[PDB]
Amino acid sequence: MRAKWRKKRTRRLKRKRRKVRARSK
Amino acid sequence: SGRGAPLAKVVFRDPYKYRLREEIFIANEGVHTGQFIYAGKKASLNVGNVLPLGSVPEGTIVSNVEEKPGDRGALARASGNYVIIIGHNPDENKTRVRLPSGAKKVISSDARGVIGVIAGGGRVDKPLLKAGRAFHKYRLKRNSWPKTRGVAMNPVDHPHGGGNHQHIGKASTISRGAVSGQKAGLIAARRTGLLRGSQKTQ
Amino acid sequence: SQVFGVARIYASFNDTFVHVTDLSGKETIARVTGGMKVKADRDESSPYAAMLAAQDVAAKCKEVGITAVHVKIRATGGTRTKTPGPGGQAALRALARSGLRIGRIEDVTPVPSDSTRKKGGRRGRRL
Amino acid sequence: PKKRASNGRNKKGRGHVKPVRCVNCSKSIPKDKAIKRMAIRNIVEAAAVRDLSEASVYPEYALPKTYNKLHYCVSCAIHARIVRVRSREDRKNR
Amino acid sequence: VVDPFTRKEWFDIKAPSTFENRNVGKTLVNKSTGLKSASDALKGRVVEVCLADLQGSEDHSFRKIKLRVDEVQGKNLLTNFHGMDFTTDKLRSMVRKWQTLIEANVTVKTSDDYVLRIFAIAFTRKQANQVKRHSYAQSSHIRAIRKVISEILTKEVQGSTLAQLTSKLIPEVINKEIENATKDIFPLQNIHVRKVKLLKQPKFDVGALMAL
Amino acid sequence: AKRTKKVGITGKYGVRYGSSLRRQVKKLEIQQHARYDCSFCGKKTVKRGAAGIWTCSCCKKTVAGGAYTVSTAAAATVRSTIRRLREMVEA
Amino acid sequence: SINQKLALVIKSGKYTLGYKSTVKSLRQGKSKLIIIAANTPVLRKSELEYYAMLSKTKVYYFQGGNNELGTAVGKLFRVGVVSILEAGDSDILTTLA
RNA sequence: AGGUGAAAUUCUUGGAUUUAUUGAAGACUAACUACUGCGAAAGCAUUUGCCAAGGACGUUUUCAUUAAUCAAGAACGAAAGUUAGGGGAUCGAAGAUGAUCAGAUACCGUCGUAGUCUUAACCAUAAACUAUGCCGACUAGGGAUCGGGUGGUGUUUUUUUAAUGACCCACUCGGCACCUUACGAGAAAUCAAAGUCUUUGGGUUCUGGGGGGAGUAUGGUCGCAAGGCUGAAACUUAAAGGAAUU
Ligand SMILES: [Mg+2]
Ligand SMILES: [Mg+2]
Ligand SMILES: [Mg+2]
Ligand SMILES: [Mg+2]
Ligand SMILES: [Mg+2]
Ligand SMILES: [Mg+2]
Ligand SMILES: [Mg+2]
Ligand SMILES: [Mg+2]
Ligand SMILES: [Mg+2]
Ligand SMILES: [Mg+2]
Ligand SMILES: [Mg+2]
Ligand SMILES: [Mg+2]
Ligand SMILES: [Mg+2]
Ligand SMILES: [Mg+2]
Ligand SMILES: [Mg+2]
Ligand SMILES: [Mg+2]
Ligand SMILES: [Mg+2]
Ligand SMILES: [Mg+2]
Ligand SMILES: [Mg+2]
Ligand SMILES: [Mg+2]
Ligand SMILES: [Mg+2]
Ligand SMILES: [Mg+2]
Ligand SMILES: [Mg+2]
Ligand SMILES: [Mg+2]
Ligand SMILES: [Mg+2]
Ligand SMILES: [Mg+2]
Ligand SMILES: [Mg+2]
Ligand SMILES: [Mg+2]
Ligand SMILES: [Mg+2]
Ligand SMILES: [Mg+2]
Ligand SMILES: [Mg+2]
Ligand SMILES: [Mg+2]
Ligand SMILES: [Mg+2]
Ligand SMILES: [Mg+2]
Ligand SMILES: [Mg+2]
Ligand SMILES: [Mg+2]
Ligand SMILES: [Mg+2]
Ligand SMILES: [Mg+2]
Ligand SMILES: [Mg+2]
Ligand SMILES: [Mg+2]
Ligand SMILES: [Zn+2]
Ligand SMILES: [Zn+2]
């Protein structure tokens, strides 16, 4: 990881964490 | 009605008898009531005129062209459609011209075409959105609607018939030489699957 | 009382073209390349292959009997390289040294009015 | 630390210029930043030329030149030895 | 073993009646059958060559030319024109740093119906007393020059049919008509006229050419 | 006041057919129903009848056009193209 | 450009607008010029020039439609043709050809 | 023929590459081009025409405090990306591939979808940089240059003179900068502002408070989406960092 691809990482993590919520109610 | 292009009743003086002849063109985009239409070899270069193709320079756009001149129009007739003059062989007067489908034909340069594009183009962009809006499209064409897929039928009805699943079963592409009764699917398909690109063949 | 020709030489890298035409060119005569008088691919533009290219070409001058020629050196040009390749000033001093008589040189590398973006990408060829 | 007032090279008053392509590798470099040098090769070779004006027509006359203006990206302009690393003080001239 | 050179012919050409050395050289075609002839295949061609060899002195090292052959003419051909050019070497020999460059083009018909377009180009020059190292022009001058160079060239043609002016250029003349029209706006060091060519493929009207 | 925040003329279709088709259908439902200017009459009163048929309400002058606009991008360039080629044929 | 030479006549001189009114100024030799919007029909064009042929006046054909001419004469409606009766203090009558 | 350190994938006797003569399409604007110009910035370079806009200068013109900087709220905003039309020459994320390599769907080679142009919509981020808020005042020399004005028996321009226009010379206001040098500043690198500060106050807005966790979570909010804007804590650490020296 350097910043631009560490950012790409926590963009994927921030977005998979975002969509796992939708499976629930 | 039934056609997506708009027509155009144009009238001419019959040069061998005192009366008028109403010839019915397909309206190129831009022609209007009251406009004067010129029709012949020495006619000039504005949309709506109809000229032999050896006259118009390389790069014009014409429509309802003749494969053999005098057939009174066979090509580029659909809404938004047209052809392009691409070259002239003057001796052996024939003109090569590229078509909607991307193909290129060579037709006797004496062939008549109509300058411009056919009006009413862009019709396909809007979705039909309502099944009935298609019922009505085809009620003024022919009984070609709706299509029920062969895979829903019993094998007595269609080669795609039968099965305890809904599968074509065997390859759905048919060789051009199949016999009528068999030709249900992708006849003489030189490929299948998802393309990405377009025409201009060689 | 002597006649001429048109050399239209094309000195790239990886190959060298000497090709003499009629001043029209709609009829032209017997090209030889740089790879016809050697077969290596790492030795296709080498001056030693340009002398061999002018050799079997001038030898075919009097194939139905003509004498002399004009010259037009053109590098790759276009969008790419714009500078004469190696076998250029080799293949010329060959047919000068080869008795065929010449004059009036011109550089006709096609140079653009800065157009049609070039191969290599934005970071270049990274070697 | 900042190395040069002209940081990359020679632009103060613009904020943007259009880039040029390196003649060796095709790297993109903004024109002002590029290092331009004139190639005006004589059209004949090292010596190699007296052999021609024998084969010449024309009281010799000939001698035209070539003109390519060369733009080099910084990476290639140093590999090619066109430009070399100067001292910390040696670094401001024209 | 075909050797398509012995079995093929060798002809000649005049292009003009303008200058002195009207005759050229030669080439071949598969000797003229019933059609496929040198009569039918041949003379859809034209030429490209320089100028000093046209009119002698070497103040004229530049200037290629085009030459449109019209019709088959008796083991010869007289080729009118399909335009002309300059040298891709000598232009680069002019455009130097620390000076402005002007460039103007125009297109004109000839009264018959044969049409063409022609270019022109000039640079700035330092006055004898200059110490300003760059001699640049004010872009108002530049378009005021561009406007009046163009006014100078079109002044000639269209009081011209296909041939009528063709006569006029050779002695490097209009460069003085620009000069007397432009030594009040800015100095201007190089003036020339690089490129022409014909565009109309009109009614050939045979009776035209034979003047030459 | 403001009736629909986003749906405009396609409010008739309700929730049927999916948000994006209504947005495609919308764009051309506007062009199809728009009042245009007459090139001859000057008056902003030409709107379409059937597809490609555009009639100035007064001045009664009909012209052919695009299926949903009086003029397409294509025709406007082919108009500016034969007129480009026309000018070398005449001169 | 030349658009601009007109708005001086409006405060200065006097004018009328329209077919039915300028066709009078011509029947009286008192329209010293008429201006015709480009988009006006040619039938009306051809016939309006005939009056200038009889009224002993030449005409300047306008480069815009009835819309652009109205804004040019400084009004908010279509205008086919305008007639100048007295230019008063105006440069227009010299500034022609 | 191609291409390369070297090669291979590719084309070609229905004749490639090369040459000619015509033509078409789409992009781009070479060389001129610079320690030059313009714009608030992002940016802006072939011609001419139309539409409005603009700074500097000049002014013995008018108004007269109308101004400066700014929560909130707005306009524009590279490239990419989104949607839908047109357009698609080229180059070219993905992909196809041929090499290389221990492996190498990587750097190289050859193709190639999207994209690259565009219209109508979004989108609002770039090391959006001078990493230097804006307004105002003062504190050093120098020579250049762009635009403007003045001046001068000055050089070139003849129309028939002159007037302009180009150049020289002094000055001048306003720029893009630059060189010298610091008295002063500073951790230094360096700075005419980063000076006029423990001799600490001209006016004003925004931002930071050890390093991670983290621009994460949660709420809100804008977006169609990608994502933007706002933004913690538990926990964890004696460093992480700047500039210079050897
Ligand atoms: Mg990175
Ligand atoms: Mg049915
Ligand atoms: Mg179906
Ligand atoms: Mg079905
Ligand atoms: Mg059953
Ligand atoms: Mg079967
Ligand atoms: Mg069966
Ligand atoms: Mg089945
Ligand atoms: Mg199923
Ligand atoms: Mg090779
Ligand atoms: Mg390297
Ligand atoms: Mg460093
Ligand atoms: Mg500025
Ligand atoms: Mg920037
Ligand atoms: Mg009345
Ligand atoms: Mg009437
Ligand atoms: Mg061939
Ligand atoms: Mg032609
Ligand atoms: Mg032609
Ligand atoms: Mg400038
Ligand atoms: Mg240019
Ligand atoms: Mg704010
Ligand atoms: Mg944007
Ligand atoms: Mg963008
Ligand atoms: Mg698209
Ligand atoms: Mg493409
Ligand atoms: Mg890959
Ligand atoms: Mg690659
Ligand atoms: Mg490629
Ligand atoms: Mg916004
Ligand atoms: Mg910042
Ligand atoms: Mg200040
Ligand atoms: Mg000055
Ligand atoms: Mg000045
Ligand atoms: Mg003065
Ligand atoms: Mg902290
Ligand atoms: Mg912390
Ligand atoms: Mg956490
Ligand atoms: Mg949130
Ligand atoms: Mg450090
Ligand atoms: Zn490079
Ligand atoms: Zn109307």
Curated annotation (Swiss-Prot), chain F:
<dbReference type="GO" id="GO:0005829">
    <property type="term" value="C:cytosol"/>
</dbReference>
<feature type="zinc finger region" description="C4-type">
    <location>
        <begin position="38"/>
        <end position="59"/>
    </location>
</feature>
<comment type="subunit">
    <text>Component of the large ribosomal subunit (LSU). Mature yeast ribosomes consist of a small (40S) and a large (60S) subunit. The 40S small subunit contains 1 molecule of ribosomal RNA (18S rRNA) and 33 different proteins (encoded by 57 genes). The large 60S subunit contains 3 rRNA molecules (25S, 5.8S and 5S rRNA) and 46 different proteins (encoded by 81 genes).</text>
</comment>
<dbReference type="GO" id="GO:0003735">
    <property type="term" value="F:structural constituent of ribosome"/>
</dbReference>
<keyword id="KW-0963">Cytoplasm</keyword>
<dbReference type="GO" id="GO:0022625">
    <property type="term" value="C:cytosolic large ribosomal subunit"/>
</dbReference>
<dbReference type="Pfam" id="PF01780">
    <property type="entry name" value="Ribosomal_L37ae"/>
</dbReference>
<dbReference type="InterPro" id="IPR011332">
    <property type="entry name" value="Ribosomal_zn-bd"/>
</dbReference>
<keyword id="KW-0479">Metal-binding</keyword>
<feature type="modified residue" description="Phosphoserine">
    <location>
        <position position="39"/>
    </location>
</feature>
<keyword id="KW-0689">Ribosomal protein</keyword>
<keyword id="KW-0863">Zinc-finger</keyword>
<dbReference type="InterPro" id="IPR011331">
    <property type="entry name" value="Ribosomal_eL37/eL43"/>
</dbReference>
<comment type="similarity">
    <text>Belongs to the eukaryotic ribosomal protein eL43 family.</text>
</comment>
<keyword id="KW-0687">Ribonucleoprotein</keyword>
<dbReference type="GO" id="GO:0002181">
    <property type="term" value="P:cytoplasmic translation"/>
</dbReference>
<keyword id="KW-0597">Phosphoprotein</keyword>
<dbReference type="InterPro" id="IPR050522">
    <property type="entry name" value="Ribosomal_protein_eL43"/>
</dbReference>
<comment type="function">
    <text>Component of the ribosome, a large ribonucleoprotein complex responsible for the synthesis of proteins in the cell. The small ribosomal subunit (SSU) binds messenger RNAs (mRNAs) and translates the encoded message by selecting cognate aminoacyl-transfer RNA (tRNA) molecules. The large subunit (LSU) contains the ribosomal catalytic site termed the peptidyl transferase center (PTC), which catalyzes the formation of peptide bonds, thereby polymerizing the amino acids delivered by tRNAs into a polypeptide chain.</text>
</comment>
<protein>
    <recommendedName>
        <fullName>Large ribosomal subunit protein eL43A</fullName>
    </recommendedName>
</protein>
<dbReference type="GO" id="GO:0008270">
    <property type="term" value="F:zinc ion binding"/>
</dbReference>
<dbReference type="InterPro" id="IPR002674">
    <property type="entry name" value="Ribosomal_eL43"/>
</dbReference>
<keyword id="KW-0862">Zinc</keyword>
